Amino acid sequence: QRITLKDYAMRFGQTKTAKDLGVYQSAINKAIHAGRKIFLTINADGSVYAEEVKDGEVKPFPSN
Incomplete structure (x- = not known):
């Protein structure tokens, strides 16, 4: 389950x-x-994957 950045x-x-x-x-x-x-999204190995929804699209965050 995803968690918001704020949470x-x-x-x-x-x-x-x-x-x-x-x-x-x-x-x-x-x-x-x-x-x-x-x-x-927190992975069991401790790493975190973040994605941003913008303009209808789904991209990685940070972008660049």
């Missing part, structure tokens, strides 16, 4: 979220702020 940060903290995603903290807070539709 993941609330559960694990902004620091772990930024690290799992490989982005810096400030970017995470802004993304949430902007209400982007970002969903994370």
Whole structure:
């Protein structure tokens, strides 16, 4: 089951979220702020896969 970016940060903290995603903290807070539709999947090995829904499309997050 996917977890929203906002709910993941609330559960694990902004620091772990930024690290799992490989982005810096400030970017995470802004993304949430902007209400982007970002969903994370935690794998049993601990890695996290994030995807964003934008304009009808489904892409990886961060994009670049």
